[PDB]
């Protein structure tokens, strides 16, 4: 409907959508355009209610604008950040391995106070990286994504605990700032309020109050409503103000001789100054809201004040007493309660813009330090802005962030959904965040405040469970970093059309209904009792008058990946989690096919992913080809679109685009014009629809295994193209220069048959394992040859050349066809790194078919590796003669509580059968709520089943009973969804009917070709002479401590001894064993492992006299050789 060119997919939804899905990539683009300060962000801020909006760069420059020295005679100011045009386009940056950045210029002004002469110049600050139109950064030619970080907002947090030694309640409060010291107050067993400034020892808070300029009378008249404060004041044992200030100085800074002004300056520096304490705008807002201070005033100050401290102490004492209300003098009454640090009103989100802003702030601080250092050394009357500003730290910090930070990750490019979910990810790990080990079973929980803000299903199932999540579909982000969700406001039981975006704090005050509540034509609730959510989650039933808000859609709590699972409510949470995670792992096939049964989140997901090509302005097609599309327009402007063809993604898959338009066709602005990798007609298509039979079969699908038909291999159904890139560079060495040529001193002549004149393979030449791709050679120097080798070379005439072959060869277990060669040379003015003279990259493409060991999966968490690929005549077939494509076991469905697939199976059949409800004698009772367009459909039609509002069980049964016959006029599947299958290899029909249907299955990126590895002898390590590890290094398999325990329990002494000695560490033993095996003798006895000698040397280097003693009592030397 909304999308101009969209395929017709009828839907089972019975509820109207008041609010459409927002832009799925706004979470990144909005943050970055706030950081830069683009015009559209300024307009949006003005239209939302503004005073003076400022970007991140403007904010950091304003907070750093006055740079004055101690004398106060000189100052430097920065202003007016401006961005020029981009250095190069995205394609050029990715091809040439550049960075997609734009120049940054800041006007710097120097003021000399004593003479009054001012200078101003435009200073170049460097090439600031720029986000593309799809939310990614091209850094060094690679696309990267900055992941939003979930952190705890600065502010005051109150906590309560129960002591197990006295059974009394103890309260505490912590003030957590950003870039500042920590201030904690607590109440202990002795009812003595104690403050711990920084991380020092406890001191009664009366001392701190007196040090702030208060007297005994002030404390008495201020805290006269309590008893613990009086008890603490009576036991202070410190009179006056100077004594308390000296005590605080002595406790805080031991070893420093105190004076009168030093302590006051220290306190001001710690708490009441902008230099070393900064309660940020978020922290200032949180403190003001919590304590009820400065209600109405704009957020200008960002430092703690004595009013805040005294309000915190009063709040703590009144909370301990039991009062549920408090009004600070000159303040607004606020409730008194403890705070939950996991509440989404206490957890904020640092987007990409805020992280980049923090890095820029660090760089500017370093630059300011350098500037202040240079100011006092140079001569006055000659200082200019450009001779003081070292821009290098700022760009260095930005580069360090983009290349070292954990939150800047490689983009996932298995399919468009992978990237789309990657950009919408909320991570709790990184600098300033939690660690996967120091996180208990408290933050890895689904808090009731995550409803509509964070998806409770989609999260990793490994060790990072609960620490990584995804944004909901309708979730937005507050300017302060909090997550908002939309709700429809209702009044007097009438649901209005006004949508308000509320955060967790605002949501807790109101009571929110459910989007599935039945409403009349105007909005009046037909039923009195309504299901709602109260403050602490609290799912309850209330009357229709108490409700004041309603959800917008039934799927407000689910993310994009979780919203593409049909019949989600019929699947358990674990299986839905697995289904989403595996749906993110599908690989693109050579030909794509949209699912017969979907959820409707396929057009929007594919369009917002960006891998599809979308027309910009309405017009007509002029020229359509396999690699370019030309579009005319009513305005009179031609748009040319270049299509990516066989381009390697970050993970090796093939990402090529194909047009779906014809010459002369008239398109509209926004219409899809060319499909992407996993895209058919603009819809996401991650897998294939296959005929599935649910039955055991001879044990070949035993324990989650899968049986496939051979038709899939023959017809290239589950076939994928994988592209690998091999790069080699000829640098300059100390012994000489490295030359790329087809010389290769010691080889045969047929190896060099596929190499051209310049020593590189030819395009289209098939390469096997070990074949030479690029012929390189390096200087060798003078080496003493063996006499036998010299005699052999003299006999055969092959002169020994002082060059060593270092050609680029295809890795073990790899093959394919060469499709592309990219050559960079320094003599042609190519920006190669220092020392490198030549560089060459070769792309090898391979078509992989489905095979035993490959992992297939579904959208309902049902995964499995293929254990058998039967011939077509061995598969069970319908009485019509149609063989089934896949056989799934029965024993795995009921115990995993993911029967939604079964429902999908049934629906799938109807989708690829057509149906016609017999409306004779009125509409059937079971079809009362079906839309009028679902009463009849043709064959191969596609249907939509939204997540929590779709087809029901009764409708499914009715549609199973109402399907139309095949070409022979007979029905193959009865009303129960079962068919009478025949045995392929026997001919007798199976005694009982079997469930058959169509299921949409996905080919996951876990292939045996990337898993199989074996080794007999290869590279070893340096310090300890043990084999390396990993398939990419031809390494060995680790025989850990558990395997040693198993061997010891078995009693196999010799197997364990040989495994430890002569397969890992016995340097002489390895070669002796190889020689004995080759020549056929017995395996010799093991020696001494090298690791033991390394351990002995490491012990001796610690001044430990470790010595091995023989039976006599002497010392055995370890210097054999």
């Amino acid at each position: 409907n909304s999308v101009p060119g969209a395929p017709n997919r009828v839907s089972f939804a019975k509820l109207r959508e008041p609010l459409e899905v927002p832009g799925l990539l706004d979470v990144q683009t909005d943050s970055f355009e706030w950081l830069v300060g683009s015009d559209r962000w300024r307009q949006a801020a003005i239209d939302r209610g503004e005073e003076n909006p400022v970007g991140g760069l403007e904010e950091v420059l304003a907070e750093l604008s006055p740079i004055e020295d101690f004398s106060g005679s000189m100052s430097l100011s920065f202003s007016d950040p401006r961005f020029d045009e981009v250095k190069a386009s995205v394609d050029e940056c990715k091809d040439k391995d550049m960075t997609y950045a734009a120049p940054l210029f800041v006007t710097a002004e120097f003021i000399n106070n004593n003479t009054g002469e001012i200078k101003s110049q435009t200073v170049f600050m460097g090439d600031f990286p720029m986000m593309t139109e799809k939310g990614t950064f091209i850094i060094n030619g690679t696309e990267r994504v900055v992941v939003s970080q979930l952190v705890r907002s600065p502010g005051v947090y109150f906590d309560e605990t129960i002591d197990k030694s006295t059974e009394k309640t103890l309260h505490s409060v912590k003030v957590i700032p950003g870039r500042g010291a920590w201030l904690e107050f607590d109440v202990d067993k002795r009812d003595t309020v104690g403050v711990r400034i920084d991380r020092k020892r406890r001191q009664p808070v009366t001392v701190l109050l007196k040090a702030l300029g208060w007297t005994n009378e002030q404390i008495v008249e201020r805290f006269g409503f309590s008893e613990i404060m009086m008890g603490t004041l009576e036991k202070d044992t410190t009179s006056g103000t100077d004594e308390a200030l000296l005590d605080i100085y002595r406790k805080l800074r031991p070893g420093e001789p105190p004076t009168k002004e030093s302590a006051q300056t220290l306190l001001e520096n710690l708490f009441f100054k902008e230099k070393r304490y900064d309660l940020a705008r978020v922290g200032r807002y949180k403190v003001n809201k919590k304590l009820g201070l400065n209600a109405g005033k704009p957020i200008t100050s960002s430092t703690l004040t004595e009013e805040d401290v005294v309000a915190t102490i009063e709040y703590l004492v009144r909370l301990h007493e039991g009062q549920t209300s408090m009004t600070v003098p000159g303040g607004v009454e606020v409730p008194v309660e403890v705070d939950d640090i996991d509440h989404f009103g206490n957890r904020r989100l640092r987007t990409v813009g805020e992280l980049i802003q923090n890095q820029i702030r660090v760089g500017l601080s370093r630059m300011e330090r350098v500037v202040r250092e240079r100011m006092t050394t140079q001569d006055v009357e000659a200082i200019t802005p450009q001779t003081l500003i070292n821009i290098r730290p700022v760009v260095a910090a930005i580069k360090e962030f983009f290349g070292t930070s954990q939150l800047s990750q490689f983009m996932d490019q298995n399919n468009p959904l992978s990237g789309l979910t990657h950009k919408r990810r909320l991570s709790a790990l990184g600098p300033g965040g939690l660690s996967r080990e120091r996180a208990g079973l408290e933050v890895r929980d689904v808090h009731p405040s995550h409803y509509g803000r964070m998806c409770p299903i989609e999260t990793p199932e490994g060790p990072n469970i609960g620490l990584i999540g995804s944004l909901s579909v309708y979730a937005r982000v507050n300017p302060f970093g909090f997550i908002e969700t939309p709700y429809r406001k209702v009044e007097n039981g009438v649901v209005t059309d006004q949508i308000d975006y509320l955060t967790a704090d605002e949501e807790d005050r109101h009571v929110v209904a459910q989007a599935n509540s039945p409403t009349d034509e105007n909005g009046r609730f037909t039923e009195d009792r309504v299901m709602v959510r109260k403050k602490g989650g609290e799912v309850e039933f209330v009357s229709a008058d108490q409700v004041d808000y309603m959800d917008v859609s039934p799927r407000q709590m689910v993310s994009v990946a979780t919203a593409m699972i049909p019949f989600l409510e019929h699947d358990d949470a674990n299986r839905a989690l697995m289904g989403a995670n595996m749906q993110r792992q599908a690989v693109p096939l050579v030909r794509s096919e949209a699912p017969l049964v979907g959820t409707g989140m396929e057009l929007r997901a594919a369009i917002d992913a960006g891998d599809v090509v979308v027309a910009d302005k309405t017009g007509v097609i002029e020229e359509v080809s396999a690699d370019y599309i030309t579009v005319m327009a009513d305005d009179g402007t031609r748009q040319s679109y270049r299509l990516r063809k066989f381009a390697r993604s970050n993970h090796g898959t093939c990402a090529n685009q194909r047009p779906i338009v014809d010459a002369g066709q008239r398109v509209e602005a926004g219409q899809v014009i060319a499909d992407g990798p996993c895209t058919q007609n603009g819809e996401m298509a991650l897998g294939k629809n296959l005929l599935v039979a649910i039955m055991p079969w001879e044990g070949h699908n035993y324990e989650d295994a899968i049986i496939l038909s051979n038709r899939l291999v023959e017809e290239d159904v589950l076939t994928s193209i994988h592209i690998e890139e091999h790069e080699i560079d000829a640098r300059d060495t100390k012994l000489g220069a490295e030359e790329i040529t087809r010389d290769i001193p010691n080889v045969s002549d047929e190896v060099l048959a596929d190499l051209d004149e310049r020593g590189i393979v030819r395009i289209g030449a098939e390469v096997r394992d070990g074949d030479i791709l690029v012929g390189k050679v390096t200087p060798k120097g003078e080496t003493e040859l063996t006499p036998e080798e010299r005699l052999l070379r003299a006999i055969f005439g092959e002169k020994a050349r002082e060059v060593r072959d270092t050609s680029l060869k295809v890795p073990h277990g790899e093959s394919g066809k060469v499709i592309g060669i990219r050559v960079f040379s320094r003599e042609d003015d190519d920006e190669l790194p220092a020392g490198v003279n030549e560089l060459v990259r070769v792309y090898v493409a391979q078509k992989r078919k489905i095979s035993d060991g490959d992992k297939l999966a579904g959208r309902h968490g049902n995964k499995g590796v293929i254990g058998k690929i039967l011939p077509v005549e061995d598969m069970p077939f319908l009485p019509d003669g149609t063989p089934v494509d896949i056989i799934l076991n029965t024993h795995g469905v009921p115990r995993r509580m993911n029967i939604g697939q079964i429902l999908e199976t049934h629906l799938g059949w109807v989708a690829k059968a057509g149906w016609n409800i017999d409306v004779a004698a009125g509409v059937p009772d079971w079809a009362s709520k079906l839309p009028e367009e679902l009463y009849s459909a043709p064959a191969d039609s596609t249907v939509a089943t939204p997540v929590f509002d779709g087809a029901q069980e009764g409708e499914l049964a009715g549609l199973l009973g109402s399907t139309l016959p095949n070409r022979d006029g007979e029905v193959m599947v009865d009303a129960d969804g079962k068919s009478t299958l025949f045995d392929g290899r026997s001919g007798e029909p199976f005694p009982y009917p079997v469930t058959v249907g169509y299921m949409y299955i996905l080919k996951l990126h876990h292939l045996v070709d990337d898993k199989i590895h074996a080794r007999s002898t290869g590279p070893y390590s340096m310090i300890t002479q043990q084999p390396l590890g990993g398939k990419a290094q031809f390494g060995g398999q680790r025989f850990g401590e558990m395997e040693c325990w198993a061997m010891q329990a078995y009693g196999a002494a010799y197997t364990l001894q040989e495994l430890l000695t002569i397969k890992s560490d016995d340097t002489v033993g390895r070669v002796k064993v190889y020689e004995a095996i080759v020549k056929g003798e017995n395996i010799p006895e093991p020696g001494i492992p090298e690791s033991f000698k390394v351990l002995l040397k490491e012990l001796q280097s610690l001044c430990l006299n470790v010595e091995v003693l023989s039976s006599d009592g002497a010392a055995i030397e370890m210097r054999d050789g």
Partner: protein
């Protein structure tokens, strides 16, 4: 506790003087290698520093 430590030193033929060092042993170089990674970049074992 003091008797435990003192009798530990008394039973063995060693002397407490070994707790104060006059010479520092240095590990063989191959256990703290200085290797040349491909491309000319070198590597250290953090013991050289």
């Amino acid at each position: 506790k003091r008797l435990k430590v003192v009798a530990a030193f008394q039973q063995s033929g060693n002397s407490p003087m070994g707790m104060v060092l006059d010479a520092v042993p240095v590990i063989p170089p191959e256990l703290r290698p200085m290797v040349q990674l491909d491309g000319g970049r070198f590597a250290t074992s953090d013991l050289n520093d």
